[PDB]
């Protein structure tokens, strides 16, 4: 079926030597590779961008299409067919940052030969002398800092990797992907625009015989996904959810299904609609909570109940409530989504944990809804 295959192509794990909107970055990475392998010179690349801009996909395409274990040939524009050994390592999925040299050894030495124990970059530096250009691609190298310690020991691993990819008479290059003169060459992957997103979607769907999308719908989805930091993953979720809603509610699918996606998965709840679903007593207790937080702003449930009792005896509207009924109406306001009760330490001379009221509603439409009720304005 065309719907199943189209959703299969629009997954965030889907695959497709240049990416459709990454031609310039591809030529930058291949001229770095030419000046690395052809010169037999070690060098360090540092690729940076927001999420979803296609760094990992571009390096995966480069490794798959254009390339001891994992031995292969690299062809130059001259065409001398140099011998390379390429590997890619995801840094977060390692238990410690100190063992990655070992995993580089575990990516390169054959299982039939002896298995030396690599402790640091000195042992790997000894290992790479008798050789064949070694290519590593470290993904999320930014997770090679240490969250503890300070400045000195945090950079302990990346500086020793940078020295190993810069010392003479080795063939160890270092491509590092991270998220936003021995310094590495910096490439910044840019967030995509709407037209780049449209061209990527048409290129990925060009394998399909029939496009189930009107092109204006793809353009609308791409231009809504083209914000300040807009990624291709969000566009894939939006389009996949468009097929999801289209075949849950039942031809080329319309622009209206994109709006249905952006309305279904954005709960655009208004404080207008929240206040309008309450009764007079929940609105009154919301007003007393607002006034108590206005005058105290580090207030407990019990101090807010005290303020409610003082206000309700000053004004004499209906009948006063007991503390547990007050708390139950506070949880009703949690269920509606206007009041939150957390549990925090005090900052007095007797610091213990207490229940605390926070408000997540904006004042203007709150006062506008409470203005229209005449029996509530003593509490405003």
């Amino acid at each position: 079926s065309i719907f199943l295959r189209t959703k299969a192509l629009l997954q965030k794990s889907s695959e497709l030597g240049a990416l459709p909107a990454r031609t310039a970055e591809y030529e930058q990475v291949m001229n770095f590779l030419a000046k690395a392998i052809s010169e037999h010179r070690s060098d360090s690349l540092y690729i940076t961008g927001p999420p979803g801009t296609g760094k990992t996909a571009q390096l995966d395409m480069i490794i798959r299409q254009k390339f001891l274990q994992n031995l292969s040939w690299f062809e130059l524009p001259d065409g001398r067919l140099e011998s390379v050994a390429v590997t890619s390592i995801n840094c977060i999925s390692l238990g410690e940052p100190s063992s990655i040299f070992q995993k580089i050894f575990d990516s390169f030495q054959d299982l039939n030969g002896p298995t030396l124990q690599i402790k640091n970059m000195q042992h790997l530096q000894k290992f790479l002398e008798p050789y064949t250009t070694f290519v590593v691609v470290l993904d999320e190298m930014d997770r090679l800092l240490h969250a503890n310690t300070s400045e000195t020991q945090s950079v302990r691993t990346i500086l020793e990797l940078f020295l190993l990819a810069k010392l003479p008479t080795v063939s160890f290059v270092l491509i590092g992907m991270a998220n936003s003169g021995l310094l590495p060459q910096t490439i910044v992957f840019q967030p995509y625009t709407a037209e780049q997103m449209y061209e990527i979607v048409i290129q990925k769907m060009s394998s399909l015989p029939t496009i189930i999308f009107q092109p204006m719908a793809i353009k609308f989805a791409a231009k809504k996904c083209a914000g300040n930091t807009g990624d291709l993953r969000k566009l894939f979720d939006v389009l996949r959810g468009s097929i999801e809603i289209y075949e849950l509610e039942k031809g080329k699918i319309g622009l209206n299904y994109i709006a249905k996606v952006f309305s279904k998965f954005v709960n655009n709840n208004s404080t207008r609609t929240r206040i309008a679903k309450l009764n007079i007593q929940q609105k009154l207790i919301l007003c007393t909570i607002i006034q108590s937080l206005k005058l105290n702003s580090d207030a407990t449930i019990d101090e807010s109940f005290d303020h409610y009792i003082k206000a309700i005896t000053k004004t004499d509207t209906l009948a006063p409530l007991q503390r547990n009924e007050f708390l139950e109406i506070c949880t009703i306001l949690e269920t509606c989504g206007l009041v939150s009760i957390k549990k925090t330490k005090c900052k007095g001379k007797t610091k213990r944990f207490v229940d605390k009221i926070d408000v997540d509603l904006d004042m203007r439409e709150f006062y506008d809804e409470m203005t229209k009720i005449s029996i509530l304005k003593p509490f405003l």
Partner: protein, 485 residues
């Protein structure tokens, strides 16, 4: 050799350290893992809790209602069910890797809906229309360590038992490098996702980044308690990998709660039992007794529970509590033991809803001794006088002494003063604290009525009311002596 300290209770599990990347010498050396005798799921404790039943227990007219209203036994969740089922079915049939994010408040049927989805998916796989898959359930609050999920999932996949780090590179190797034809699809339910959140956030990144791998065939269904969890606690990478689509389980309306309770009360409401009048045991079809639980009671309980939480657990528990109140009154009236119409009325439902609302704190302060009430009265007097929420204990001592020595002409004070300062006894000198001063101070500290700071000078140490001031005032002027003065 003499040790500086000893560890004599070390319990270490039999977990190997070599990960799955070093099992075989090559990628081509890996066989089809679906044929291995240990991979993909290929209890001994259930008989330990067996005994010999030598009695005959009595199940009364309301026993079947209370047993049937439990949480162990899908009307109102059919759009969420359709969304989760269609996404997971498309991910299984195309051999894809997919994250499904589900969030909601407690008891709104998240775990029930995901479990019903995976049961229908396994039944659909049993009819050979989608490929076979392995279902893994990981609950973050059922783990000792957060990294034990690495221990759990890999043990569900391979049948090996490794330490958590080696399990993590084993799972990374399995999801990225092993081809699809040698693998089986895996559906993982991550439940209580916030419990698996650490400072490094490595488990979150790994579990949602494996769903971005081409070869993984991994479906992660993550259950959250809030929808804003990836923005509040997780980074932009994990938020990008989780995705824009997020399924929210709203709290149940009172129609939905009433439909749930009526679904559990089908076959029992408006039915007849054969009831023995000698013992009390009742049999579903000696007297023929009709059992009803009224729909107005269910609708009152459903409306209250739907406004407070929309929680199916609370609606079922309120109905079960009302039935237990009715059944307790029934056993009291007929003298039945634990070896024409019986109704769970609306009054039992109101009692069940009011028993968690009745504010025992005021009742507790009313039923205290005179010294504890005098302490609370003195503290309230100081908060009225100097307007502070924290009062020093020496000030409370001095104002208790003033309250005794000013209104002496009260007859109760003339009766109580010798007890308060000499314990009714000559040869006991006059005391600086009252009798049972530390006793009532520690008693009010145990109840949570009071907070005391941690100082070693007993006079400058501060005391604060942890309870609201108005309930302390109404408890104090309930007392006839303290409201007189």
């Amino acid at each position: 050799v003499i040790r500086k300290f000893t560890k004599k209770n070390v319990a270490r599990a039999k977990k190997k350290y070599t990960p799955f990347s070093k099992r075989f010498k090559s990628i081509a050396a890996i066989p089809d893992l679906t044929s291995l005798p240990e991979f993909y799921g290929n209890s001994r404790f259930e008989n330990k809790l067996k005994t010999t039943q030598k009695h005959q227990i009595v199940e009364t007219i309301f026993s079947k209602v209370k047993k049937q209203l439990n949480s162990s036994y899908l009307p109102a969740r059919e759009n969420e069910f359709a969304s989760i089922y269609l996404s997971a079915y498309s991910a299984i049939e195309s051999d894809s890797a997919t994250t499904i994010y589900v969030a909601g408040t407690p008891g709104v049927g998240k775990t029930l809906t995901v479990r019903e989805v995976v049961k229908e998916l396994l039944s659909s796989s049993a009819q050979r229309e989608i490929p076979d898959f392995l279902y893994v359930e990981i609950n973050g609050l059922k783990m000792v360590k957060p990294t034990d999920c690495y221990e759990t999932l890999w043990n569900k996949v391979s049948g090996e038992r490794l330490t958590w780090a080696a399990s993590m590179e084993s799972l990374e190797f399995y999801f990225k490098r092993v081809p699809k034809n040698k693998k089986k699809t895996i559906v993982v339910l991550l439940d209580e996702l916030d419990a698996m959140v650490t400072k490094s956030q490595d488990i979150m990144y790994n579990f949602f980044n494996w769903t971005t791998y081409e070869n993984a065939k991994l479906i992660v269904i993550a259950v959250a308690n809030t929808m804003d969890l990836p923005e509040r606690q997780l980074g932009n990478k994990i938020t990008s990998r989780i995705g824009f689509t997020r399924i929210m389980f709203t709290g149940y309306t009172h129609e939905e709660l009433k439909n749930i309770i009526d679904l559990r009360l089908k076959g029992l409401n408006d039915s007849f039992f054969y009831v023995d009048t000698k013992t009390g045991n009742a049999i579903l079809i000696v007297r023929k007794v009709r059992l009803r639980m009224s729909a107005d009671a269910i609708e009152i309980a459903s409306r209250k529970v739907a406004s407070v939480s929309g929680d199916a657990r609370r609606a079922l528990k309120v109905c079960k509590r009302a039935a237990e109140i009715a059944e307790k009154h029934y056993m009291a009236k007929h003298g039945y033991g634990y070896d024409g119409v019986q109704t769970v009325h609306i009054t039992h439902v109101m009692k069940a809803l009011n028993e968690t609302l009745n504010s025992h704190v005021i009742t507790f302060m009313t039923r205290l001794s005179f010294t504890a009430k005098l302490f609370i009265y003195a503290l309230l007097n100081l908060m009225k006088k100097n307007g502070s929420q924290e009062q020093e204990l020496g000030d409370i001592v001095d104002e208790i002494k003033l309250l005794i020595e000013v209104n002496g002409s009260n007859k109760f004070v003339m009766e109580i003063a010798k007890t308060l300062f000499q314990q009714g006894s000559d040869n006991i000198s006059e005391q600086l604290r009252i009798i049972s001063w530390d006793f009532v101070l520690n008693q009010l500290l145990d109840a949570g009525i009071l907070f005391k700071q941690t100082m070693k000078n007993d006079r400058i140490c501060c005391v604060k009311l942890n309870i609201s001031v108005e309930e302390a005032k109404r408890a104090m002027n309930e007392d006839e002596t303290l409201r007189n003065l």
